Write a protein that binds this ligand. Sequence first.
Ligand code: EL5
Ligand code: EL5
Lengths: 488, 488
Amino acid sequence: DLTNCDREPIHIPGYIQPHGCLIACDNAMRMVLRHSENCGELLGLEGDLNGRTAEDVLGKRLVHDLRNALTVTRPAMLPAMETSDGRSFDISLHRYKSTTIIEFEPSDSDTQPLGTARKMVDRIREADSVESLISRTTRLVKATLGYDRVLIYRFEEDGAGKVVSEAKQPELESFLGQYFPASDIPQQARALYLKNTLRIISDASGTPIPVLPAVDVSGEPLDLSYAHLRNFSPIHCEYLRNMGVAASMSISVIVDDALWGLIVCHHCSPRVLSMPVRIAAAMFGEFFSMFLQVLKQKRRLDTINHAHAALDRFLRLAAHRANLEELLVDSFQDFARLIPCDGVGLWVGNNWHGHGATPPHDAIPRLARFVASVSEGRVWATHALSQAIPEAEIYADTAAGMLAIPISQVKSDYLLFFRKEIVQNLNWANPEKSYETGPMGDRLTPRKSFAIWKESVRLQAQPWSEADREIAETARIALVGVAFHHSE
Amino acid sequence: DLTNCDREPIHIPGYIQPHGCLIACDNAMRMVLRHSENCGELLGLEGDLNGRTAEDVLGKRLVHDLRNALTVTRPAMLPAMETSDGRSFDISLHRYKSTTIIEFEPSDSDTQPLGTARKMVDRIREADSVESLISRTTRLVKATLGYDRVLIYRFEEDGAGKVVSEAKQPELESFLGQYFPASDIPQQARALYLKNTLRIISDASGTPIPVLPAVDVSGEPLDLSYAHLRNFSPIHCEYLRNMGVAASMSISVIVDDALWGLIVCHHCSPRVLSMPVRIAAAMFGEFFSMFLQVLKQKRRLDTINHAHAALDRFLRLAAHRANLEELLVDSFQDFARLIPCDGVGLWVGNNWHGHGATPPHDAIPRLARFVASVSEGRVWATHALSQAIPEAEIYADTAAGMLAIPISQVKSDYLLFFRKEIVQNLNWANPEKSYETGPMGDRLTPRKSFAIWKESVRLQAQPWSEADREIAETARIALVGVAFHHSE
Ligand SMILES: *C/C=C1/C(=C/C2=NC(=C\c3[nH]c(/C=C4\NC(=O)C(C=C)=C4C)c(C)c3CCC(=O)O)/C(CCC(=O)O)=C2C)NC(=O)C1C
Ligand SMILES: *C/C=C1/C(=C/C2=NC(=C\c3[nH]c(/C=C4\NC(=O)C(C=C)=C4C)c(C)c3CCC(=O)O)/C(CCC(=O)O)=C2C)NC(=O)C1C
């Protein structure tokens, strides 16, 4: 099924990843309800474990220490824990839907979990712009965790993902500046990714180990939402195998409690991160998120400060010039400085004055009449002009988006901002690389995903941000206010 | 009924105000469905009008011009229109719920509707602060429209109204700085006030003239939402009569599409504003709203700019000092500069350091433990501390509100901001004046309304604004970020 993607319940796969073993106990960790087939192979146990008491299975010495963890749904990390037979394991212990889930993996005592991160964070803390934090992060994460490719994948308004930063081995293909459909990361995944900060895929071509029982007596599956060993969707694993990506590690970037995007790592060989390096990467993820949040806030405060200053400058000029209509005709191009636009236009006294990428002179009367019907003396905007006026499809390559600012309360005069269709402004330079395809078809390749997105945004501009509308509303109040001062 | 206030359907009173007459016609203004009893007295008509055709009743010459108005639910203002018998009327014409409503009133051709407003707006446009716009507006509106009292009544988070500005005759009582319950202006009214910019009460002791029919054949009343003659609730009219207020004119202040508050005018004698002065006041209302919106935005941008600068200054100090714990103990009082607070405290290394109005030393351990349970490494805040900790009622007169900023990701260390209970910070200086009371009791007086509000906010502080939380979150990321840099 490669449609209704949001359907698949990824949280309850009924499988885990080979690189560790999973024991699910009751709410109070007394009786083993479920286990992973490989529990035997790794712990050195014989036979079925389901019905045996936690104290019996793992040991009275270990089960005691694990009870003190849950005394804290944030998974408790217990590095280098000992079994009765002496073997040493790193243990992830969490409690979700009144089910205690214990994950075991071969132990790492070499790496330091705080020290590693403290140095990584130190290098991104002093970044003074969103672009500087982002650029350095991919490069940094690659050098440190040694993944063949690191992307920052940022989510657009429409749910589509743009690759805004990339560090990679020279040999590998670049996805920098390419967009991907909202469907490529469906809604239940983003819901899960807001819960699980960090995520591993040890092997995309690995054999997934089943959890027994898959479904229990009461007829409910084992929710592996907060289980780091949870096996990933076969749709995504095929997608990674088609890209020649054997292993994966993604970090959830959380800004203002939204999912802003992912730090996504690819490895061409199989790769297991140890509990300690996964804690470090998780901490870096949190700090990277916090800094990007504050840098985004500073940019918003700056963008608007800069627009306020521009309008004060223009209101001081309007005090000196007698003819305001004359001042606007000489000045209107300068408003393209407030709101990112490919063109700006002035419709004043049934006359049209254009600058940059605007619709054709003959097409404006239609537009001016239309805006004057739906505006209602407030800011009107759209990124899909042709959806509002079919006639406007002809010039979508020039002006696909329009934001309209009324400049007179009384008269029907407008300041019109325009944007080219997003595929025009597209800067990726080509996806010449051909990709091998598995059972499910050529849909599961970056080449097709990109082709799909490009159709989904045809005749459509870069949407107007909250900041573009905030500035536009402030410009309306400034222009309407000073146009009243010069009444006829 | 002086409870469940939101019940009363003020929009369909089945009455109008004496100072004009009302004719409701069908959707296309052909047949007179309803009229006000006084239609006869003012238009010079005899008998019932309900069933007679619009062309017959008002005239073919007039009904034609009225059809061209609805060719525009914004009421069309038609000043100095003539009837068949020669009489001259100002006419408000609107169409709501497929019912054309025509309001007539004695004509004013003396006042200029734009010129008056253009001068008023000119005096508020150059205001550079919310306090300066507000202060000048009451004073200005009083001098111009000549009302005995003008208030600006601002709505609080909890729906309560504060009187933030006042111009009045020396003899009259001051309501400056007094709050009023959310119930005093119920929800259906605010819903109506978002629709009707401006509102008149010609006489609070006037005899309301009934609309016939009150309820029609189809069993639906006449919606007078956009009718300027709509009779006001008898609850409010009694309230005004108890205040010695004979007439009223309120203006809806709309900021970011919210109802921010009202410019409320009181007159001790009866007072009808003419259509032209009502248009002017309506225009001023719009401009006053637009400017206050932009001044509010500038203040928000400034408040946060100022907090960013403060934290950068503090992060530069943290680079020089080795012991960060020492720097915070010396500096924490300075954070009271970021967020308006009556006290600030530092809980670091199980030690307490206080500055300003904070809870007692002995009470902090309880607080520090509590915050450390519900915080979850993010900013936690409340204006009703005693609702979270009953024990905290004892010191509500000192600290009724608390905002808590984590300063360490690892350790349980907090920066605690405090606010006194709102009745402490209360600056109104007394309501000695006694008020006469009508049939419905002493509830309908400012004295009682204020007593009611004062109980509704006991043990409660001034709520933490979006701006206080925005700054607090930015301070968390700054302090948590630099505390990681100085790991143990
Ligand atoms: C219709 C179903 C589809 C689908 C489902 C799906 N995708 C999921 C995760 C996921 N997808 C991406 C996409 C990319 N990663 C890349 O590196 C590139 C490179 C060009 C692309 C396009 C990513 C990053 C992820 C996140 C996986 C991770 O956390 O590492 C999932 C959720 C996986 C899970 O089981 O948790 C599902 C389901 N993807 C499709 O493309 C389609 C058609
Ligand atoms: C339980 C019912 C009550 C109630 C209902 C009610 N109030 C309405 C309007 C209204 N109330 C105020 C309040 C004041 N105005 C003042 O000047 C002062 C001065 C101290 C106070 C406290 C105001 C300003 C208004 C707005 C009226 C206007 O637009 O001029 C209404 C709506 C009236 C209508 O029919 O449109 C209703 C209903 N008010 C109560 O106090 C109570 C108990």
